[PDB]
Symmetry: D3
Subunit: 301 residues, 6 copies
């Protein structure tokens, strides 16, 4: 009777944050697949948490089985390191596109709700003051700029999923804009996750989104009250936290003193999900320092 | 000994015209795959022409075998009908991308020269005065406009090929700009090749039907006679000194830049000169319901190539060729 | 050391009652496959009970591994709902026959005991007074009566298994005749096991819904308490001296021969005795919209078995078991 | 535009006689698959006859390709030899059912007309005065009589095809009743087509071997000359106004109703009239070892068809055709 | 963070002794696959011991996943029973070579350290005083002596691994020379590990059965206590600065050099001292029905290793361990 | 009715000579598979010659279909170039063993006669005076000498075939000893058939390039004219009353027993007699760089009714004659 949520790549930034919220705030069962459990801590001991081992490129039977068993499908496995797009464009395509296509097709076959991570980068060099999921044009560079294979792969997957939507697939696309929070993803981790630049730590701006706001929108998508999220595409970002790299540096140091254009349009996200981001840039970063104080070891790695 | 050219989807516009030039002007052997031969006429009786049967979505072993056998690989099979992009986007992805990828991957495996039909559509809503294959940005609409699945499939394919190029694949991408001539592909033929709009307009003229113009036919296009298209293709296949390896060429005549309305008027005027068409053409009503110029600098310089045919010669050649084959012209839009 | 019994589709009527008997009366290990465990209660907690997850149409490797590991193989997964035969005949074939064949073939490959649920329906419109698994002819209606795809699929599987038997497969076929008891499978559960007619009547009765008597409801059938069914299965699994190898057993009580009408009336009269049912049952009308008696002589002598439960005992047990689980009862037809 | 007919298992009795009619009386194209051509006479020469090599159990790609290419699909490959049903029941299931199913599914996928050889045996031990494809019940013996695996495999294939018909498959099932004529398939040839008893009896006769009658050879059967068989098929393939779509036709001559004893005697009487046969025919004794009328009303009415050849006409044709081909006749039982 | 060691075929001689030493003397994690855990004792309790179920011939996905997950890959599954080489050489090839090749290939793909059990038998009838892994010639009998398919399959695997080493594969081959100790694998267990001749002799001794000496039992061999074997394996798996990468190591004690006859005598003589063995030992008849010294110079010097255990100390160790498990000793030859 | 002989890798030395013998002396049908026909001359125009296209690593369906169709199965496709064993051992294994295994398994399934080219190399460093297929030990070097992956792959295949023989497979193994004749396979052609040492010596001689003599070139070998090799093969394919079923035959002329140096000198002397080769041949020097190999053929002679007729000298003279209007094809032997 309880809703079953399938998270592929659950040891990630998103997976462990989403699992926590689910276990703590609902009666849903979590089916979570990954290779390691190091980001989950105590979640795995929870009686509605069901971790299992597998890789989407290898455990095809075990993955398909859980797609049939579950109600809502989150395939979160994906290469999302900008350095890899340039150096090994083919690895990006093989994992983010080719390895995920069967999982999409299983969600179709078994009539499930596919909640898929598109990308904030899908807009590319779009010039709109606000990136509109229903309206903005999508602009990439020429073929001889291979970094664009990431955006192009994600866009094609969006259109393939949209195509299946035209034939009856219940899907929601979401595009996270620079989610940040405790438990940041490791630079080389194969998951849609956290903002790289913030871990590492100049006038390029981006919209930073505290993870709790991101997760809240996701919960509403999974709950899908009245089927409102079906067929829809949502930017999940805080456009009020549009800060430059210099500003990030300066605020992070000003915050560390206490302890011893790519703007997402989110109108449809707010209205349709009854959602609004609560965390200011300042709140967001304060939260990350409060969290990592003990674990200086986990920070470096 | 002789160079071997594999054409997947040979029974049609590019298949016919390319095979013809190859047989008549080189010692190369042609291996052409398709389901039927009714567009090849007498080419099959030539000793250097090797037609064989197969379908790229079915005959995987027989196709791969030919990729290992041949030197140059041209996979022309694809849905390239604008209406289908909107109504059936999944079928466009499945065939144009998904079913061509194993062919690309065989070309990688056996060290062959992959000569792949990219598309003029890949530039999308590009604002550049000339679409430049080494420089222009590529712009599509949002996900809720599914017609863009074609340009997006074709883009991702160009990038996957580019990624193999970075690992040693010998490839050339070509982007035909509105190739037109005798033996146009039927509107629903799943082959890269001939300008659909010109084909559609020709079918209307000969059936005596109205020609419908969106936004008063303001859309401008660069029209290219097939002989010009083929000559650039020949140079790519020859690949003197490896000059075409790693390259992307628009193959178009930027000097034949006309609006869709100008195209309709010109074809209507031309139809009236021919007694085979005039009477159907008389019945045609033009009814009512932005700039796409190819840069061809690299194409002309690297390949020693220049387009020779004006808009006028192009269309005339077309009307000449169909005059005793009006039934063929009429069936172009069925 | 100990016998390992593999049950595929363990989470239901047969899986539950059998497993229980195995755990309480033998030293055998039970390996049970299904998607959920809600029909197994605390059985999973027992050290000789090994539940594992999978679907026969998906987990090919995991199922075959278990066929190699275990000694006796009971593949229970099957659409066995009459309504479904008529409306989705292909689903019945795909699951009951096609998805079960690889499992049969692994039992062959690894030299296991295949204990396979055939069906009392295999006899079809047989005219014999007693359905004899070694002698009775098997009669179905024409192709335009798709209801018979179920019996025909099951007959073909029995013949395939028999063909494997000719080549050395150790098999036993069993044909349950309307097994009934606690934990009936709900009507769309895709498992061989419980009498659908008794299950649907129970559901409708507890819901105060009218009952359908097809063709006046004079078709006579034989009803069997689950404990009698299970006792016989236990004998088959133990297979003392190889007595059940190559054999085909009807498991049912021929003395419990009642018509559909008689069943409905009996169940109505019984429900009136219980406080949980009497109110809803009073609201039940019978609505109008030959003999199927099993020979069990070989089953009796070869397995040293005899059914113990009368019709009344059986139905009584069922009503008692559901008194505290009225929602389970209501859900049987959901 | 011309209709394309696909025959899998073309090199034999049906493939030869069907192909000949098609080529002689229509503009349709034949695509015929087999391993050899020795039974096709001079047909291959015909420019509308397209023979190709392959085996339905091996050449999956080449078979699927031709299914997509063609309009009408006749899969004739099947073990149809009564002795093999008994001794090798698994091979019968594997070829007749399991290897034909992917062909049925390709016909579904590509929207083709599947014209499938069901069997006269599907009725089994039916008691009806005439075997009615829309109504007659179907009765086989028990599982311990494996001969029934042929009829049961064929029945299930019919129900699977029927299930696909419910989802939109354009099919016609046909059941030939002992078709006979020149070019009989030898007894161990795996194709549906010719009467094996007639073929075997001819074998013995030409070889001077005794003919065996079982249970006194009293069983009546309907015998059909091949030309009447083909005329029905042609009407099916033509499918005037879609009338054959979703139908099941017995194709036989109910007026040619003869026992096995009578068949032997008539064949022996007839052989004595032929110099080439008489010396061998004299040595044949009938040795004792220890009714099947087709209803053809729907066939006659929907196809506008009537069987024209008497049993006597039919046998005379056969003896005439083999008269200067004694070796071939002897080979029918090898 | 911590090194992950994958052992395929863990429930046996090497598996138990290796996992124990890993858990006690490192912080590494063990991932061990097998069908059962009965040879693992209490090792499964350890938090760094991860038993999982599977068979390399079936659970392809689960095996490949663990190869990607783990750092060092030990595939121990193989028929290594001499009589089976003779009786079923195909089974030996299929398991030892064909079924292990995909495991090797995954180790290549994912960049892992392949630590592979080659065999002392690979030298065959080598005439060298010391079998040198870097220099000794490898000598087998003719094709009509099927016993050599074992050594031939193992040889080819070593050369295939060496080929992948040339391309970057990080491998180490190890060749155990008659490893012996508690927990000997039963004779028909398909795992590389323990000395079959010693296991067979112990089995007969405890069963009061005769011992067979082929050709007087004058064949000499080197015998190695298990702790000495494991110590070398630990160094290989630690692989300090890649010292064992690309290397081939015999792991034997050349000072324990005894004939089969001397082995039998010494085992019987030592059994007399044990009251649990003495009585069955007196019933044993020794009945009539080449030096094999490993060079270990590279093993000693590269790995910092030396065998500590004398032959007599090794046999007494074995006799002590089986003292309270006579059942287990007797099951060795079943 | 007529016997059907399947030759996989028909466009080369054995394919050509065998196909010719079959067409001229029997009523058998030849089904030959390759990528090209340029080594087949006129043969394809013959009504009992059926050439078809395919590659054993790719056209699995089309190859298996032909195995089922035909009666006798000759899979000739294999890397057999000594330099490639050392440079690319994996490719040798993959083609010679792995890609041939399914063909063997099809022959088992469809009850055919598998006639498999094993190799004289299978004996390895055998010390026997005559290499006996039924008795001689098989000796290779260590793992770190990858040249031995060829002999080891071919040995394992012979043992897998033998194992299927034990369960009923109709097989014959044949081991050519230095078959030499017109139409030599170039040294990089992936086919069993011709002596590489003779082929490379010819190639270098006609190109006026040095010839290498490994370890002084003292090792003696047996050299067999192709006609003698084909005569034995024909008897195997006919297989009258199953004489060849389950058997292993060396096919060589042990009377043509000459050292590698003797071969060089003999070829150089022969080259000097032909105007097309003489100028090139004068330029060749022998380069030394840092064990007899006699086939026993008693079973082959007595079982098959066979004996080699051609001397070393006739054999090489026939080769030199054949190539003299085809100098470019001789030079290509080592390209
Ligand atoms: Cl870039
Ligand atoms: Cl805010
Ligand atoms: Cl659109
Ligand atoms: Cl111009
Ligand atoms: Cl029905
Ligand atoms: Cl009773
Ligand atoms: Cl029978
Ligand atoms: Cl009549
Ligand atoms: Cl042996
Ligand atoms: Cl010592
Ligand atoms: Cl070497
Ligand atoms: Cl001689």
């Amino acid at each position: 009777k309880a809703k079953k949520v399938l998270i592929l790549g659950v040891n990630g930034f998103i997976g462990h944050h989403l699992s926590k919220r689910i276990l703590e705030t609902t009666d849903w069962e979590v089916f979570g697949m990954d290779m390691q459990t190091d980001r989950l801590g105590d979640l795995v001991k929870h009686e509605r948490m069901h971790f299992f081992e597998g890789d989407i490129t290898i455990n095809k039977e075990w993955v398909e089985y859980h797609v049939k068993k579950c109600d809502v499908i989150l395939p979160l496995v994906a290469i999302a390191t900008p350095a890899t797009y340039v150096k090994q464009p083919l690895r990006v395509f093989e994992l983010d596109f080719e390895a995920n296509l069967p999982i999409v097709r299983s969600a179709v076959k078994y009539g499930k709700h596919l909640v898929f991570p598109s990308t904030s980068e899908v807009y590319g060099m779009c010039a709109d003051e606000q990136f509109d999921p229903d309206a903005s044009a999508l602009t990439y560079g020429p073929i001889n700029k291979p970094r664009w294979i990431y955006a192009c792969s994600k866009q094609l997957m969006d259109r393939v999923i949209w195509g299946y939507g035209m034939e009856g697939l219940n899907f929601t696309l979401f595009r996270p804009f620079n989610w940040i929070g405790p438990g940041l993803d490791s630079i080389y981790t194969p998951k849609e996750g956290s903002s790289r630049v913030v871990t590492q730590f100049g006038s390029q701006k981006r919209a930073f989104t505290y993870v709790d706001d991101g997760i809240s929108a996701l919960m509403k998508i999974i709950e899908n009250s009245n089927g409102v999220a079906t067929g829809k595409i949502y930017n999940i970002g805080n456009p009020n936290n549009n800060f430059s790299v210099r500003e990030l540096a300066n605020k992070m140091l000003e915050l560390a003193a206490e302890f011893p254009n790519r703007v997402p349009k989110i109108e449809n996200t707010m209205q349709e999900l009854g959602w609004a981001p609560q965390f200011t840039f300042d709140d967001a970063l304060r939260q990350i320092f409060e969290a990592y104080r003990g674990h200086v070891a986990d920070a470096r790695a």
